[PDB]
């Protein structure tokens, strides 16, 4: 009853950062220390936990937020950062329990030409909750008058198009990331390590 | 299991004060919304407020903000609707709502039982 | 901003029953769909596009136009007779928007 992380890590095609795909895990046994002995993961990052101490613990849920984003944007992915992806479209919470990996992936989500399949929320009247998800496509009212559907004067699309060229430089590359949160609630541990 | 249980009903004359508590049990409380809704006898969902336990953020409708209190604490799960002065339009039933995050983001997912309040003069 | 729905709908087992929600620009806000039975608390039967919560049928569905949303479902049966709510979201005012609520009733 292994846990199905290569349904989330190995996956063919991932969601846009502003609605970013959440995977529940529970029931399963899963080998942490197995994903970090592969290096092909650029950031694996910890916080609350040691990536050792992942095999030797339970927890009640595990939750698997994929998503993708620049390179240079990685460094949002963070309790405490600020930026149009760690305000408008994913939060970490300042008690976050869990990891974050990112990895390059240029060669799948580039293409020639641009691949504009891949969006983000540019424009947002307010910062988002940890782990919220805005999907909304309302046109923005930057000024004072309302917009009423138009795009125009001082109204804009919500969101824009990364659009990844393999040519492309290292800090606007696109990379894939997941999260996992890891979440104790005095109910069963559904999720272990081998221990 | 995620569960909101609220307290009991109330009977109070018109004036007078009332504080209704709402506690949350088998989810992280800090990490989602808590709303209000009124509910007239035999009407429709009235959205009043809503606050965020993990920084106490507030929201309030327009029609109800100044009228009507929400607060929490964190520290034992519970979520705090208040009345200073009560009127005889407040009868009716009031439920707290949890609001949900990612998919459930915009939605409130989980309902308690509803609090009656009775103004009687 | 006023949220309208038709005060009633009444259908027959087994058909479809759509009940819509009319507004300014709802078809590009995040509108979900509540059912509440007689007696009971609400419950939510729709999220934003048509993403179903856990244990909510497949009959149950969402579709969005400029100026409406419509929850359908196909092949009602008797249990489904109740009150169903749309919900914005409203992220201008970050103001939860309460439709009027529409009466589904099954004829028996």
């Known amino acids: 009853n292994l846990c199905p992380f290569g349904e989330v890590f190995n996956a063919t095609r991932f969601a846009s950062v502003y609605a970013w795909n959440r995977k529940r895990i529970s029931n399963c046994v899963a080998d942490y220390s197995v994903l970090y002995n592969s290096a092909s993961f650029s950031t694996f990052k910890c916080y609350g936990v040691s990536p050792t101490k992942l095999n030797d613990l339970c927890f009640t849920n595990v939750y698997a937020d994929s998503f993708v984003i620049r390179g240079d944007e990685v460094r949002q992915i963070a309790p405490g950062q600020t930026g149009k992806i760690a305000d408008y479209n994913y939060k970490l919470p300042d008690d976050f329990t869990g990891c974050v990996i990112a990895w390059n992936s240029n060669n799948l989500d580039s293409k020639v030409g641009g691949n504009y399949n891949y969006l983000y929320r540019l424009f947002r009247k307010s910062n988002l909750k940890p782990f919220e998800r805005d999907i909304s496509t309302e046109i923005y009212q930057a000024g004072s008058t309302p917009c009423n559907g138009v795009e125009g004067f001082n109204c804009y699309f919500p969101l824009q198009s990364y659009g990844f060229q393999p040519t492309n430089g290292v800090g606007y590359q696109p990379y894939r990331v997941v999260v996992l949160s890891f979440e104790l609630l005095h109910a069963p541990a559904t999720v272990c390590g081998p221990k | 299991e995620v569960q909101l249980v609220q307290s009991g009903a109330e009977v109070k004359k018109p004036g007078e004060s009332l504080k209704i508590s709402c506690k949350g049990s088998?989810?992280?409380?800090?990490?989602?919304?808590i709303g209000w809704v009124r509910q007239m006898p035999g009407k429709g969902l009235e959205w009043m407020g809503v606050?965020?336990?993990?920084?106490?953020?507030?929201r309030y409708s327009p029609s109800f903000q100044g009228q009507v209190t929400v607060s929490a604490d964190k520290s034992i799960s519970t979520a705090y609707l208040q009345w200073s002065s009560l009127k005889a339009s407040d009868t009716a039933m009031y439920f707290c709502?949890?609001?949900?995050?990612?998919?459930?983001?915009?939605?409130?997912?989980?309902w308690g039982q509803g609090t009656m309040v009775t103004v009687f003069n | 901003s006023a949220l309208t729905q038709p005060p009633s709908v009444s259908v027959a087992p087994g058909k479809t029953a759509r009940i819509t929600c009319g507004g300014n620009?709802?078809?590009?806000?995040?509108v979900h769909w509540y059912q509440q039975k007689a007696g009971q608390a609400p419950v939510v039967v729709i999220y934003?596009?048509?993403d179903r919560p856990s244990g909510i049928p497949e009959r149950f569905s969402g579709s969005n136009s400029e100026n409406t949303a419509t929850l359908t479902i196909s092949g009602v049966e008797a249990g489904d007779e109740a009150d169903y709510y749309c919900?914005?979201?409203?992220?201008?005012?970050?103001?939860?928007?309460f439709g009027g609520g529409t009466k589904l009733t099954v004829l028996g």
């Open positions: 934003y596009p048509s």
């Open positions: 606050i965020y336990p993990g920084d106490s953020d507030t």
């Open positions: 088998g989810y992280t409380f800090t990490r989602h919304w």
């Open positions: 620009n709802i078809g590009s806000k995040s």
């Open positions: 919900q914005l979201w409203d992220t201008n005012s970050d103001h939860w928007v």
């Open positions: 709502a949890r609001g949900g995050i990612a998919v459930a983001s915009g939605a409130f997912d989980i």
